[PDB]
């Protein structure tokens, strides 16, 4: 209907709870493996944030896998930073991690993050 | 870290995608039964929005069930309105549904919705 009212903080409060479930390992259904570092997560959150995971988990065969191995060139710290961003909206971008974060966001197909990384790099040149 | 940047629209864009997955029946893992009306959903979203579902899906036995039957006194339309609110932040509150929505939100333990229903009722008295 066109007559709905909207609760402003609802989406952020939902994301905060999904991150609390992740921290407590509640209903996590996939392990992402990045160069032997393992990260537990919810498939739905990964699909909701990344073009790569959206493609993987809508595939008839890959949707059922409980372990996904990323390309060996992917940096585990860059992945960890992006996984935290998916569950919090906050991106820990620093001079010492920006190149790894941008390369990881390109691989993961997270366009807004890639944009932002490009702008921070361009400002330093 | 204390040096994070924040993407304002991220949480709302995540919720929009979780609702698109629900509409396409992608990775839904539970059916909620309300007086023979069935609603498919994601356990994590229900837990993130409702005190009742948070209690149900953190129980060692109930966490594994694929079907949950609600109390027969619960109105299916009231439940449908609240399930839409969980996935969109928008509540379709109308004179003809407010009593059923408030009773359902009380049962589901959604305090902000109950508050709001009380204020709209009080204004009409």
């Amino acid at each position: 209907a066109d007559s709905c009212i909207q609760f402003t903080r609802h989406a952020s409060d939902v994301l905060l709870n999904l991150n609390r479930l992740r921290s407590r390992d509640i209903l996590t259904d996939v392990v992402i493996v990045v160069s032997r570092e393992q990260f537990r997560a919810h498939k739905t959150v990964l699909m909701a944030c990344s073009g790569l995971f959206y493609s993987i988990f809508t595939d008839q065969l890959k949707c059922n896998l409980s372990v996904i191995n990323l390309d060996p060139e992917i940096n585990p710290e860059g992945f960890c930073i992006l996984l935290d961003f998916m569950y919090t909206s906050r991106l820990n971008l620093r001079e010492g991690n920006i190149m790894a974060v941008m390369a990881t966001a390109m691989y993961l197909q997270m366009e807004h993050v890639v944009d932002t990384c490009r702008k921070f790099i361009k400002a330093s040149e | 870290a204390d040096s994070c940047i924040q993407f304002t629209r991220h949480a709302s864009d995540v919720l929009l995608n979780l609702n698109r997955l629900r509409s396409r029946d992608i990775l839904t893992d539970v059916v909620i039964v309300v007086s023979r009306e069935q609603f498919r959903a994601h356990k994590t979203v229900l837990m993130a929005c409702s005190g009742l579902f948070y209690s149900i899906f953190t129980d060692q036995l109930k966490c594994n069930l694929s079907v949950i039957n609600l109390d027969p006194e619960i109105n299916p339309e009231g439940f449908c309105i609240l399930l839409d609110f969980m996935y969109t932040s928008r509540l379709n509150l109308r004179e003809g549904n407010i009593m059923a929505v408030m009773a359902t939100a009380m049962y589901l333990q959604m305090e902000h919705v109950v508050d709001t229903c009380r204020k709209f009722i009080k204004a009409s008295e």
Binding site: I5, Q6, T8 | R90, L91, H112
Partner: peptide, 5 residues
């Protein structure tokens, strides 16, 4: 909170 969207 609540607003008219």
């Amino acid at each position: 909170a609540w607003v008219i969207p």
